[PDB]
Coordinates of C-alpha atoms and ligand atoms in Angstrom, one line a residue:
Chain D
X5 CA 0.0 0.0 0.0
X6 CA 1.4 3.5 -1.1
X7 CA 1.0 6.8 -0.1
X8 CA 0.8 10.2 -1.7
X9 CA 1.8 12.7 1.1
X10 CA 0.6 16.2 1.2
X11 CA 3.3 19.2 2.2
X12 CA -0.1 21.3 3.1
X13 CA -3.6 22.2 2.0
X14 CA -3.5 26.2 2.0
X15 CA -6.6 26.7 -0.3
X16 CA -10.0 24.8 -0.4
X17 CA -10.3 22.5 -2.8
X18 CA -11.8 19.3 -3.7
X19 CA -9.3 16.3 -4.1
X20 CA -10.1 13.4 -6.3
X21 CA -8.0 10.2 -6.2
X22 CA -9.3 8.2 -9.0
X23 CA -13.0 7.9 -8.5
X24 CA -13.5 8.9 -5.1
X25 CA -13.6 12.7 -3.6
X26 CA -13.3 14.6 -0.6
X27 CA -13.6 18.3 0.3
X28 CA -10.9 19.9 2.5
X29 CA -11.1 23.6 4.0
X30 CA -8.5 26.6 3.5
X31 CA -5.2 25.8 5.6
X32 CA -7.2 22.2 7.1
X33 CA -4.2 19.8 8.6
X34 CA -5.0 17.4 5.7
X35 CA -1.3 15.7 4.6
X36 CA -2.3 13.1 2.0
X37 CA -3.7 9.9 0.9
X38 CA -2.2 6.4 2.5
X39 CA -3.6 3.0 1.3
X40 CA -3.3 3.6 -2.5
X41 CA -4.0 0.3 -4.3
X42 CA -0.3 -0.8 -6.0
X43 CA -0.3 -2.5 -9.6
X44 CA -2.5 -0.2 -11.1
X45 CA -2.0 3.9 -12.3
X46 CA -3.9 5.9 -10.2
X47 CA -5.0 9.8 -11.0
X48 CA -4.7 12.8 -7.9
X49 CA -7.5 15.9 -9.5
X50 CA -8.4 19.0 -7.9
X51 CA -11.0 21.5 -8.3
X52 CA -10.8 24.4 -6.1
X53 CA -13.1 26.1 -4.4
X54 CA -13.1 29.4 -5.8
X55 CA -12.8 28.5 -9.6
X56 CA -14.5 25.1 -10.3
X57 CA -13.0 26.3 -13.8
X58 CA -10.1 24.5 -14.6
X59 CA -10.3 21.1 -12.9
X60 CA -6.6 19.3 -13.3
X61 CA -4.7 16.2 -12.1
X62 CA -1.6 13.9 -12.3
X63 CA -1.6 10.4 -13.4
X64 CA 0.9 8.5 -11.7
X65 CA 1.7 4.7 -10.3
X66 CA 3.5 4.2 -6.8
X67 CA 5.8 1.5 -8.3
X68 CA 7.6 4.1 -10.5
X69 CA 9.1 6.9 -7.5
X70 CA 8.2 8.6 -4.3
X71 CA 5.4 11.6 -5.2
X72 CA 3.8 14.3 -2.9
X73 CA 1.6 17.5 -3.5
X74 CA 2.8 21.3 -2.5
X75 CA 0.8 24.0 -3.5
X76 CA 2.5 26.7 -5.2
X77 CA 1.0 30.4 -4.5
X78 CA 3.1 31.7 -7.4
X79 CA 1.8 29.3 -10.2
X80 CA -1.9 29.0 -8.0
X81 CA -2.0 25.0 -8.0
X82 CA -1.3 21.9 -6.4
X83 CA 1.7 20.4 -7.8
X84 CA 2.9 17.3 -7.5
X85 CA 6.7 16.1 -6.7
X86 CA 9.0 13.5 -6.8
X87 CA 11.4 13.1 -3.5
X88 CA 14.7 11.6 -4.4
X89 CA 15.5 10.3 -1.0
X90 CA 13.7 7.2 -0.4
X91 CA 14.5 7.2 3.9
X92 CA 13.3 11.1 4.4
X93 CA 10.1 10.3 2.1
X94 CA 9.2 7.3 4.0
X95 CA 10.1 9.2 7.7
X96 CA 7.4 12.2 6.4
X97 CA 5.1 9.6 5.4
X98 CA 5.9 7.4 9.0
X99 CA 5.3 11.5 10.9
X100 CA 2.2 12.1 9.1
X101 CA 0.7 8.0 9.3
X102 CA 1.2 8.1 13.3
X103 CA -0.3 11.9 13.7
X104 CA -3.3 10.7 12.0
X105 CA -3.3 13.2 8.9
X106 CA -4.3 11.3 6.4
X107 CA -7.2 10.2 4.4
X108 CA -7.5 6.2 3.6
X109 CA -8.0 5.4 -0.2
X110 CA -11.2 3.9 0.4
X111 CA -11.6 0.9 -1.6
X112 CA -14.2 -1.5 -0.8
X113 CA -13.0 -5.1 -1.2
X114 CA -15.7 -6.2 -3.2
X115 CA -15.0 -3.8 -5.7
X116 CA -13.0 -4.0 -8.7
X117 CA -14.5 -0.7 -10.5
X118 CA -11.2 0.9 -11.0
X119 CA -9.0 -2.5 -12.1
X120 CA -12.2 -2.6 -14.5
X121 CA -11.5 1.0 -15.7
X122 CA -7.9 0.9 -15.9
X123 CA -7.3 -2.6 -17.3
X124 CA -5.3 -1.9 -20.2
X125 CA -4.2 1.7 -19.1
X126 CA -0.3 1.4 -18.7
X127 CA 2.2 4.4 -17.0
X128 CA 4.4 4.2 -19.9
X129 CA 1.8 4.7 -22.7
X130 CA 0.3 8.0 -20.6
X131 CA 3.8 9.6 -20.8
X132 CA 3.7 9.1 -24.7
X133 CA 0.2 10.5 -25.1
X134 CA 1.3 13.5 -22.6
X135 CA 5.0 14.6 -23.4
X136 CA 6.8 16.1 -20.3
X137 CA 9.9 13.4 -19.9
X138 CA 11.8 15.0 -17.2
X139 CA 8.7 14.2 -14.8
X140 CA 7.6 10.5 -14.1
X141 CA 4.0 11.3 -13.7
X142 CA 1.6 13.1 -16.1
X143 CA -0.5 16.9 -15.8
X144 CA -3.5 17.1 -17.5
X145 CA -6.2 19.2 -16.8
X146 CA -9.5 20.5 -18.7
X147 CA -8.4 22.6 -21.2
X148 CA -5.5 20.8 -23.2
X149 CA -6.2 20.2 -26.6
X150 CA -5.2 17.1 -29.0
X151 CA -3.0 17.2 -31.1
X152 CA -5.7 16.3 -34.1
X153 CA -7.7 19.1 -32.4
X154 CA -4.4 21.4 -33.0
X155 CA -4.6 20.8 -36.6
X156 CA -8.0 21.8 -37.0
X161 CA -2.3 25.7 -30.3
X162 CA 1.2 24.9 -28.1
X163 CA 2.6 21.7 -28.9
X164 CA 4.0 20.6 -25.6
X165 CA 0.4 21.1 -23.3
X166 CA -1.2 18.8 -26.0
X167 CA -2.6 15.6 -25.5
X168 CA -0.9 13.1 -28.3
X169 CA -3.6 10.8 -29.0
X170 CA -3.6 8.3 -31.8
X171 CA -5.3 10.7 -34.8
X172 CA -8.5 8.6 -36.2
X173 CA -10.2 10.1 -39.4
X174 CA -12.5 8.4 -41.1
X175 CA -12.3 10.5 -44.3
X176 CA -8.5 10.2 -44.8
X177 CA -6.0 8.2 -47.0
X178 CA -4.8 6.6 -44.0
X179 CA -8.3 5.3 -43.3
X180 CA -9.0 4.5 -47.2
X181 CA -7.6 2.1 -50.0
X182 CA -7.4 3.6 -53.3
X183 CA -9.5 1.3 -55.2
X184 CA -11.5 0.5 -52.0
X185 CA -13.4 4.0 -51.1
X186 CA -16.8 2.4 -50.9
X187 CA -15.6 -0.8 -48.9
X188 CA -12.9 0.8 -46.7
X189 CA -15.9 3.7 -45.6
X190 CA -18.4 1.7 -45.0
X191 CA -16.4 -1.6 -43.7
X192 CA -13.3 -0.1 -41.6
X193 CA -11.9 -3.6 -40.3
X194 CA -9.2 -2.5 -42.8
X195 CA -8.5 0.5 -40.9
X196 CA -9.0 -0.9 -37.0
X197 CA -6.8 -4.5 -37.7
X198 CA -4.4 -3.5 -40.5
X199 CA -3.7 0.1 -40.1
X200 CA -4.5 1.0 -36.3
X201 CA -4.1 -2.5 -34.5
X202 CA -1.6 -3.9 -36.9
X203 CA 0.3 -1.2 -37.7
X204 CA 0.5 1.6 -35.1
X205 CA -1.1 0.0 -31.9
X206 CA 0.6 -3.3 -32.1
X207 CA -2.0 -5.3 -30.3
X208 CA -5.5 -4.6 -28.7
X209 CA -4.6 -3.9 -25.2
X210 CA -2.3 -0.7 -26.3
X211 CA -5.4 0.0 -28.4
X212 CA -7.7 -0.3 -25.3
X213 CA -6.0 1.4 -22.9
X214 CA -6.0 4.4 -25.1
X215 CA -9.8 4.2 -24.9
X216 CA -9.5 3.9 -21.4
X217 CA -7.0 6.8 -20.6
X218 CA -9.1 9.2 -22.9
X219 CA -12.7 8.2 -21.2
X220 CA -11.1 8.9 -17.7
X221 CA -9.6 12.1 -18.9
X222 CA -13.6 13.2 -20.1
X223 CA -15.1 11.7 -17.0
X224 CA -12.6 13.9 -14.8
X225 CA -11.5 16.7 -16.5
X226 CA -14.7 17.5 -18.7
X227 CA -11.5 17.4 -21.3
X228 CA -13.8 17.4 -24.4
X229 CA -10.9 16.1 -27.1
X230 CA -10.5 12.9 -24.8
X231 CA -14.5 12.4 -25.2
X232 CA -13.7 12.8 -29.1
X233 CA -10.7 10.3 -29.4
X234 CA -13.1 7.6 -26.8
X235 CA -16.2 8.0 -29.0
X236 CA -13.8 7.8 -32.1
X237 CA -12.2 4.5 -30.8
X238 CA -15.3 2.8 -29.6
X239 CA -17.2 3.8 -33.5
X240 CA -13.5 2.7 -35.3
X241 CA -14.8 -1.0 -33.8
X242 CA -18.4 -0.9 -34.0
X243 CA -18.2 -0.3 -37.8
X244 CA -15.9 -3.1 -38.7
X245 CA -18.2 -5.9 -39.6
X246 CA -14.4 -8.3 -38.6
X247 CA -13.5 -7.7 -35.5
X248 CA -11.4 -10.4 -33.3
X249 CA -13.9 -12.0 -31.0
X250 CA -12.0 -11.5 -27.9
X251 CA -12.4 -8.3 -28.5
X252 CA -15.8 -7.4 -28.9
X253 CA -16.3 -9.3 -25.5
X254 CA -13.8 -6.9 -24.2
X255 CA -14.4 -3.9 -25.3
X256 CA -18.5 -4.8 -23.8
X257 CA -17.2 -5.0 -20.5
X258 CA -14.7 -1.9 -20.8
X259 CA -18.0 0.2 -21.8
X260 CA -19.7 -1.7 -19.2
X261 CA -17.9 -0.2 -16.6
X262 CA -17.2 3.2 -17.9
X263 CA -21.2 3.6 -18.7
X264 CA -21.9 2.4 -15.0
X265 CA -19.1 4.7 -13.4
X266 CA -20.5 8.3 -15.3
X267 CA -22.5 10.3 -13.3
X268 CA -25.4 10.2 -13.6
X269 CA -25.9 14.7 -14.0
X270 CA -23.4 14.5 -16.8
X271 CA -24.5 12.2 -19.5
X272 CA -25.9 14.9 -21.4
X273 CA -22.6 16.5 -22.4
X274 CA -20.3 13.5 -22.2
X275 CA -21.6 10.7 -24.3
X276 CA -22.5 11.9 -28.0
X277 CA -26.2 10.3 -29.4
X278 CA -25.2 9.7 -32.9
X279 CA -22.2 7.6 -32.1
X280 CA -24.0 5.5 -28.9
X281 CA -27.3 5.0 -31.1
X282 CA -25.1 3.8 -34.2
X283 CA -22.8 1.3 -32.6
X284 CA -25.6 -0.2 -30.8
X285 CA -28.1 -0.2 -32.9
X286 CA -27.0 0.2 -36.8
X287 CA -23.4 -0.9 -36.9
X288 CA -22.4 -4.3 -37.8
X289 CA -21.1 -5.1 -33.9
X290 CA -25.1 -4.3 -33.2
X291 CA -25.6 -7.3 -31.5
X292 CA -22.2 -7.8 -29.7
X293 CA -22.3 -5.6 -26.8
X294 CA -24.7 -7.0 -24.6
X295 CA -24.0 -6.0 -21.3
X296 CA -23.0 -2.4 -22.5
X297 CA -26.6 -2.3 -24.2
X298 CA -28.5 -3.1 -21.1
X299 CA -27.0 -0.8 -18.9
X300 CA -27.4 1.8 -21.8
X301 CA -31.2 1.6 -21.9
X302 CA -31.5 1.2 -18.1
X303 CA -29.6 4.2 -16.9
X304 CA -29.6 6.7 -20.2
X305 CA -33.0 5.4 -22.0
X306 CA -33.1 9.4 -23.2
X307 CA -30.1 9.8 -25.2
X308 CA -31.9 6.6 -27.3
Chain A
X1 CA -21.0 25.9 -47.4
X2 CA -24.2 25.4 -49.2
X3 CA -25.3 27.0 -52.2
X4 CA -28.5 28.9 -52.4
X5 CA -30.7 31.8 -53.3
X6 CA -27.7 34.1 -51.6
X7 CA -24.9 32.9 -53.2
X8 CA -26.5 32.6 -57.0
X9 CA -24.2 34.6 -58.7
X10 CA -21.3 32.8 -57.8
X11 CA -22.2 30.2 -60.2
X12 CA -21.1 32.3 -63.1
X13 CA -17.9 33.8 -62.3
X14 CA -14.3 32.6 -63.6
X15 CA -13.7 29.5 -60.4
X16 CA -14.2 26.9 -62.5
X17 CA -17.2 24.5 -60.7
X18 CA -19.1 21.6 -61.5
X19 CA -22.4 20.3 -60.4
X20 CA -23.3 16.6 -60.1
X21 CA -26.7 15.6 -60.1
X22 CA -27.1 11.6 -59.4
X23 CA -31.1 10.7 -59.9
X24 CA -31.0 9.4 -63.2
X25 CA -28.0 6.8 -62.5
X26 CA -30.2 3.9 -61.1
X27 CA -33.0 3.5 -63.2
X28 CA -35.6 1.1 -63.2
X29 CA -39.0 -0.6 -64.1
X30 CA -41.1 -2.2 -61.2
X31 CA -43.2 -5.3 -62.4
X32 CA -44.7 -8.4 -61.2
X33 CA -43.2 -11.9 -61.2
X34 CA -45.2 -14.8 -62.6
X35 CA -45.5 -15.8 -59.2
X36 CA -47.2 -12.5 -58.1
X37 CA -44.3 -11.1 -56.2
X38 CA -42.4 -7.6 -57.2
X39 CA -39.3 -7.2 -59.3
X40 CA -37.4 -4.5 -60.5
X41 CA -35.4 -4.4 -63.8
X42 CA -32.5 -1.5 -64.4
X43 CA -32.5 0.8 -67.6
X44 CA -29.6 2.4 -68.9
X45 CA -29.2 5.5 -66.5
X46 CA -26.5 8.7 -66.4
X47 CA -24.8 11.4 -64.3
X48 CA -25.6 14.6 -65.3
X49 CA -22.1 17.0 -64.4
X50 CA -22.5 20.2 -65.8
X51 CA -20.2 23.5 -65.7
X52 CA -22.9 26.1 -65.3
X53 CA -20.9 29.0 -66.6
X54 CA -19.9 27.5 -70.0
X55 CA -22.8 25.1 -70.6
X56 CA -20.7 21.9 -71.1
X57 CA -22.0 18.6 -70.3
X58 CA -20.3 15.8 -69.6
X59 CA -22.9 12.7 -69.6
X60 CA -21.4 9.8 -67.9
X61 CA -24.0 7.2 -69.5
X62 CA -24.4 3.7 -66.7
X63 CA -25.4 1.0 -68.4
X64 CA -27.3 -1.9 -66.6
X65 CA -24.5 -4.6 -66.5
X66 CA -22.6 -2.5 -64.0
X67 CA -25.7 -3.5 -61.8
X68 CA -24.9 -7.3 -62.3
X69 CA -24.3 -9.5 -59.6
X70 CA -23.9 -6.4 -57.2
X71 CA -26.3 -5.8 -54.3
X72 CA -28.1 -2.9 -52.5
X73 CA -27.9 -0.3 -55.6
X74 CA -29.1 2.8 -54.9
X75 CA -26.9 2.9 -52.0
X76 CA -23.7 1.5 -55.0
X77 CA -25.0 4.0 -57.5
X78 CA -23.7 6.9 -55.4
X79 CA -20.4 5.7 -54.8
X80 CA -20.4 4.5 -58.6
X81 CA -21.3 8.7 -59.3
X82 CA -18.8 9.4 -56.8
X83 CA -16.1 7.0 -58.9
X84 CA -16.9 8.3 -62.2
X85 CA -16.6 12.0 -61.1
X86 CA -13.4 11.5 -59.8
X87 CA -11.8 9.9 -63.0
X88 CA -13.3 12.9 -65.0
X89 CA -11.7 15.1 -62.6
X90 CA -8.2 13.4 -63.1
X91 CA -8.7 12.8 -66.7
X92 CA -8.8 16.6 -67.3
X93 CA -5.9 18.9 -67.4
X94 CA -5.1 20.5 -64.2
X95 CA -6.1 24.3 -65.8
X96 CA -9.8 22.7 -66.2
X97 CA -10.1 20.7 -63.1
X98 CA -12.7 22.2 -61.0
X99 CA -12.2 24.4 -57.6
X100 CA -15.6 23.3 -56.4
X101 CA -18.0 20.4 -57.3
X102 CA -21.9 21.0 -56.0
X103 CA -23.5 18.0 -55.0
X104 CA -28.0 18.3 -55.9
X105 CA -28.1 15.5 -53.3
X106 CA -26.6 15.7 -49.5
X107 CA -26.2 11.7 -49.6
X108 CA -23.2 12.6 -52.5
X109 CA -21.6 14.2 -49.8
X110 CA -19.6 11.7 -48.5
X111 CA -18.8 9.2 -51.5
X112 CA -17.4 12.0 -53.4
X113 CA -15.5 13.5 -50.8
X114 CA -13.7 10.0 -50.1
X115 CA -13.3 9.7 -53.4
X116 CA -11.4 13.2 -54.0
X117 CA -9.6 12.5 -51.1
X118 CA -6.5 13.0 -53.4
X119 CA -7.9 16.9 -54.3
X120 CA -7.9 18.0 -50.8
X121 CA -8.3 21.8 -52.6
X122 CA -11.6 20.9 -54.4
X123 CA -14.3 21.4 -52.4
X124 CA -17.8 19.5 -52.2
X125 CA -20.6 21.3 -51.8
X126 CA -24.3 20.7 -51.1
X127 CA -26.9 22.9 -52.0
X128 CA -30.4 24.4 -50.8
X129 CA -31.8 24.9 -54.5
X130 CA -34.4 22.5 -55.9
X131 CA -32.8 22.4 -59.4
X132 CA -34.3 20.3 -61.8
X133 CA -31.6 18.2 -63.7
X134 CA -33.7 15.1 -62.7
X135 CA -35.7 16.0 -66.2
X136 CA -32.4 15.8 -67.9
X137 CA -33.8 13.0 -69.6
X138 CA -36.6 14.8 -70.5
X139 CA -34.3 16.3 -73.3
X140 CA -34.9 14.0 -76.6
X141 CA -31.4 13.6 -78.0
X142 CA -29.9 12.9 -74.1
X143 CA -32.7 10.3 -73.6
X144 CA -31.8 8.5 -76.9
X145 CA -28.0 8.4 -76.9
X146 CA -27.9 6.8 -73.0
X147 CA -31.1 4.8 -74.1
X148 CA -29.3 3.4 -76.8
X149 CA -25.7 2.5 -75.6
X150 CA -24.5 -0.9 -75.3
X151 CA -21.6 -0.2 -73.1
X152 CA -20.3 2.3 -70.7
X153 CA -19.6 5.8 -72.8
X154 CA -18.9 9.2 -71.8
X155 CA -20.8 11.7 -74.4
X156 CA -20.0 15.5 -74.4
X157 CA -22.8 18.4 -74.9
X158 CA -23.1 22.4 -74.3
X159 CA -26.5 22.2 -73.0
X160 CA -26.9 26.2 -73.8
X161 CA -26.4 25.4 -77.6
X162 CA -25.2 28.6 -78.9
X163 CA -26.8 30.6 -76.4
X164 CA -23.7 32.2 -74.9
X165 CA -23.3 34.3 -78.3
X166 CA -26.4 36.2 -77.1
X167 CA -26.6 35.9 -73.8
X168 CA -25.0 36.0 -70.4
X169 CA -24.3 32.6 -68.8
X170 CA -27.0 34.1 -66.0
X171 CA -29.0 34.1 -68.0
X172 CA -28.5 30.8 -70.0
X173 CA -29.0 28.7 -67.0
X174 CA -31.7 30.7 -66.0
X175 CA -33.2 29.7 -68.6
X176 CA -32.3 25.9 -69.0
X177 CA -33.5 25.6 -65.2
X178 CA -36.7 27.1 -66.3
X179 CA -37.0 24.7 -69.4
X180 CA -36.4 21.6 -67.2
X181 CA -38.7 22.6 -64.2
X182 CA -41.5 22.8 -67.0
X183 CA -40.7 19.4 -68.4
X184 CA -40.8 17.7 -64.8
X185 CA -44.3 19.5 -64.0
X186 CA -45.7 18.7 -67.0
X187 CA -43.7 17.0 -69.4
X188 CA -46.2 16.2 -72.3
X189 CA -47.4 20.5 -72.7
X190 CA -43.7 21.4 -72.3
X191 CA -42.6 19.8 -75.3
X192 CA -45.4 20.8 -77.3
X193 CA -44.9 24.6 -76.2
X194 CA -41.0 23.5 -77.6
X195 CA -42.4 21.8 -80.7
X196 CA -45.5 23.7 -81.7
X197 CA -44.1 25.6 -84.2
X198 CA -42.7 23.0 -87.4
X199 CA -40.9 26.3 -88.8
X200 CA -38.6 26.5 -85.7
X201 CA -36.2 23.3 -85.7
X202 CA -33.2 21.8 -84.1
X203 CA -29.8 21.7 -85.2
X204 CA -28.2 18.8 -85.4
X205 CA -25.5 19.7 -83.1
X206 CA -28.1 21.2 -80.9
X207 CA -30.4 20.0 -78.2
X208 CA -33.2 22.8 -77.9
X209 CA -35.3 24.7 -81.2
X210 CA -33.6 27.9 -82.5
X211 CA -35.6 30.6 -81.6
X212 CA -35.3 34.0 -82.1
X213 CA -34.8 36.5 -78.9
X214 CA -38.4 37.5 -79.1
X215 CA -39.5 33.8 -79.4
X216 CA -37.9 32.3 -76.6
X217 CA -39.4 35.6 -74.5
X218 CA -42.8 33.9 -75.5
X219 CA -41.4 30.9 -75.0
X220 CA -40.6 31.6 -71.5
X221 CA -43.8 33.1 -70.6
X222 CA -45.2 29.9 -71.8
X223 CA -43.0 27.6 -69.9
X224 CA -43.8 30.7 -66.9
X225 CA -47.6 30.1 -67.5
X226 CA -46.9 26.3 -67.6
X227 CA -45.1 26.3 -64.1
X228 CA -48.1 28.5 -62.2
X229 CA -50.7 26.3 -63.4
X230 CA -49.6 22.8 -62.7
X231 CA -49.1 24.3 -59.4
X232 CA -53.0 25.8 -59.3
X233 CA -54.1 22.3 -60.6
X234 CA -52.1 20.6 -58.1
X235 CA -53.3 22.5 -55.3
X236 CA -56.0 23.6 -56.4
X237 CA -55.6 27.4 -56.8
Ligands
WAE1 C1 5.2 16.2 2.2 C2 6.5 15.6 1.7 C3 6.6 14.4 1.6 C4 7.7 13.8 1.1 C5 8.7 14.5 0.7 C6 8.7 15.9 0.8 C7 9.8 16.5 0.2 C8 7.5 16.4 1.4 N1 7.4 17.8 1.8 S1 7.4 18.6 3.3 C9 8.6 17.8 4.1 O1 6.4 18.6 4.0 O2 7.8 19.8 2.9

């Protein structure tokens, strides 16, 4: 079990640590989060008090370095830190753990919602989709735009997701325009899985990385690339069965994990009413279906 | 963007621009089988791509054996339209490829812009007008040469005939569009307002009767007249 020490809280704010929350006052003795879950990433998000605009966060894993949170009052956030020296990170962490000023990750044993949500979602893959190398952990926050957002504006706050376009050459066989557009297994196994993703749990966890970055940042080019990913499969009429059966319980778990206030501006109608209803994997996302027309009947 | 009632003049100026209209590429005859059920048989059919400034025609004629063995054919007749446009557009020099190609039907949207995906600096365009190439066949000479072809063919026309020595290209399609709309309301009294008069005839290299300025001003009001009624008889008016 790790630990995420806090230097201080000196504004209000409300911490997330992946899908749980907590409010904590202006100048409260809070000093971190103890109990942290090891073997998966995790994500620390803030929202402060005064300017629920810009809500922002680091994705991180425990295994990878010793991190903590200071705020900064010239920059106006809560930044987080690595700490070298492994015997004074673990003597603060011992201080804080026996004074009692610490919050417990509160995981219920039961569940496994955030192993389900994070599944494919790999430390390595987030620092290639957000570019700051000399930091071991990854900033993101509501407003970065993608780079395929970019081309249609500063390079290194961008999020570097995989571009999908389904009116491009890359997406389209000379020779095959009517097949390739209406068919796109070409384009998901050859081109995407094949070629750039290499297998389908690189290809999932990007799905995965850009839904939580909508779900907690409201980051509205993440909702883009997810819906973009989960339509690329849905209108391939071949799709590897392991993956459809897959991919149902990924949108499973992301579908029962939205709240409930913010379906209306996260999950797009055309793209949920074509994949499961009109596209050729119709009939192959059975558990993802029922929960659709259970919780969000409206949006279909 | 679209095209419509605000941005009418742009058709004639010196962009070079093409429209495509697609409803006379999948053509057919509904009948009944022995058996009593339904069956449809396909006609020769065409796309009608036309530059509006200069009159020229280029009529892609579809003949019915590139409907064999295929299935679901209106939705393979657009992306055949889409196919055939782009090979005309790469079969011209690049001085006469078009900037812009209009589109009479949103669902030729999409097929043609995947397949100009190679002219990323032509742009597709849909349009708000309710033009009237559909009656495109109406025009004797075009139904007879697609009619009668026995394999694919391209067949070249100015569909102004020599109408541009007298008259602005405004006015020339003006004029053709009022011409067709007449021959979809009312097919049989348009031609005979065309034909009525045996001293007025058609040149062999031309589609339409060579009248005189002051007898295609009648002839319009007739066409005009035409147009108004249908639309009284129709709704009663
Ligand atoms: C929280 C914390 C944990 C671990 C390491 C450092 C450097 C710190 N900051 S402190 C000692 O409070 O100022």
């Amino acid at each position: 079990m790790n630990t995420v020490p806090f230097t201080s809280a000196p504004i209000e704010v409300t911490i997330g640590i992946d899908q749980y929350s907590f409010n904590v006052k202006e100048n409260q003795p809070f000093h971190g989060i103890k109990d942290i879950p090891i073997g998966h990433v995790h994500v620390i998000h803030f929202q402060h008090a005064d300017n629920s605009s810009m809500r922002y966060g680091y994705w991180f894993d425990c295994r990878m370095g010793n991190f903590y949170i200071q705020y900064d009052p010239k920059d106006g956030l809560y930044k987080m830190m690595e700490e070298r020296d492994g015997a004074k990170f673990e003597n603060i962490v011992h201080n804080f753990k026996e004074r009692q000023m610490m919050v417990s990750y509160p995981k219920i044993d039961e569940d496994d919602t955030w192993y389900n949500l994070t599944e494919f979602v790999q430390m390595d893959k987030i620092r290639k989709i957000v570019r700051k190398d000399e930091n071991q952990f990854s900033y993101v926050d509501s407003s970065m735009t993608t780079v395929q957002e970019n081309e249609l504006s500063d390079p290194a706050h961008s999020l570097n997701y995989t571009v999908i376009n389904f009116k491009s050459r890359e997406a389209i066989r000379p020779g095959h325009e009517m097949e390739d557009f209406l068919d796109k297994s070409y384009y998901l196994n050859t081109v995407m899985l094949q070629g750039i993703f290499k297998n389908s749990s690189n290809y999932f966890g990007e799905l995965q990385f850009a839904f939580l970055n909508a779900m907690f940042f409201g980051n509205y080019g993440s909702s883009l690339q997810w819906h973009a990913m989960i339509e690329l499969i849905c209108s391939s009429a071949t799709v590897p069965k392991h993956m459809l059966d897959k991919l149902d319980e990924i949108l499973y778990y992301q579908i029962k994990t939205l709240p409930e206030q913010y379906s209306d501006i996260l999950l797009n109608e055309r793209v949920w009413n074509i994949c499961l209803y009109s596209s050729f994997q119709k009939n192959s996302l059975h558990n993802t279906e029922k929960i659709m027309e259970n919780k969000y009947p409206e949006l279909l | 963007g679209a095209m419509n009632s605000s941005n009418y003049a742009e058709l004639f100026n010196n962009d070079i621009k093409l429209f495509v209209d697609d409803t006379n590429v999948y053509r057919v005859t509904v009948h009944k089988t022995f058996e009593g059920n339904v069956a449809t048989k396909a006609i020769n059919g065409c796309i009608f791509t036309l530059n509006p400034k200069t009159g020229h025609l280029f009529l892609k004629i579809i003949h019915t054996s590139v409907w064999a063995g295929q299935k679901r054919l209106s939705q393979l007749a657009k992306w055949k339209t889409a196919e055939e446009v782009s090979a005309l557009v790469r079969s011209l020099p690049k001085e006469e490829q078009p900037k812009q190609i209009i589109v009479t039907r949103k669902a030729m949207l999409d097929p043609l812009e995947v397949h100009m995906l190679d002219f990323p600096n032509i742009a597709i365009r849909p349009t708000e007008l309710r033009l009237p190439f559909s009656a495109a066949m109406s025009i004797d000479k075009l139904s007879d040469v697609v009619m009668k072809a026995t394999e694919p063919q391209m067949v070249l026309f100015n569909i102004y005939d020599d109408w541009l020595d007298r008259i602005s290209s405004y006015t020339a399609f003006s004029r053709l569009t009022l011409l067709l709309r007449a021959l979809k309301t009312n097919e049989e009294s348009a031609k005979m307002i065309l034909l009525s008069d045996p001293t007025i005839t058609i040149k062999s290299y031309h589609l339409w009767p060579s009248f005189t300025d002051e007898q295609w001003i009648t002839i319009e009001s007739q066409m005009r007249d035409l147009i108004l009624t249908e639309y009284g008889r129709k709704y009663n008016v």
